[PDB]
Amino acid sequence: QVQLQESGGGLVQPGGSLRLSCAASGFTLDYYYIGWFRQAPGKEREAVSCISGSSGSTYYPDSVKGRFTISRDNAKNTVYLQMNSLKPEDTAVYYCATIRSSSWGGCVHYGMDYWGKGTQVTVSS
């Protein structure tokens, strides 16, 4: 039942912006925490943005804090990651993940229960 489907990947120029969407099915945002993760080529997968489905409270790691913002639309059951001022080092597959807020334990890859299949973002150079 619980599934996530990311979309919006494509080629961006450096300094450009891109918004990714994560469509939730099998659940509603209110009971969960939604996270965005990324894997740049050769690199370990790392957290990027978490959001609370109910309150909309957010968590941003140092590397993207300021440039990346996550938002959620309860009515559309969708979580969005806005990326501003993109850098070539942001090239990665961006994954959506979620966990029931009852089990919420921080914005870490080992604390997620369901994973999307990813969507590739490439910042040309």
Residue numbers in the entry: 1 to 52, 52A, 53 to 82, 82A, 82B, 82C, 83 to 100, 100A, ...
Wording from the paper:
RSV F is a class I fusion protein that is expressed as an inactive precursor, F0, which is cleaved at two sites by a furin-like protease, leading to the formation of the disulfide-linked F2 (N-terminal) and F1 (C-terminal) subunits, which associate and trimerize to form the mature prefusion F protein6. The isolated antigen-recognition domains of these unusual antibodies are known as single-domain antibodies (VHHs). Here, we present the isolation and characterization of two llama-derived VHHs that potently neutralize RSV A and B subtypes and selectively bind prefusion F with picomolar affinity.
Sequence analysis of F-VHH-4 and -L66 revealed an identical complementarity-determining region (CDR) 1, a similar CDR2, but a very different CDR3. F-VHH-4 and -L66 both have a cysteine residue at position 100c in the CDR3 and at position 50 in the CDR2. A disulfide bond between the CDR3 and a residue at position 33 or 50 is a hallmark of VHHs and helps to stabilize the extended CDR3 loop conformation. In addition, the crystal structure of unbound F-VHH-4 was determined to 1.9 Å resolution. The presence of three consecutive serine residues in the CDR3 of F-VHH-4 could lead to more flexibility of this loop compared with that of F-VHH-L66 and allow F-VHH-4 to bind to an altered conformation of prefusion F. Although the possibility of selecting for an escape mutant could raise concerns for the clinical use of these VHHs, the escape virus was severely attenuated as it was impossible to grow the virus to substantial amounts to make high-titre virus stocks.
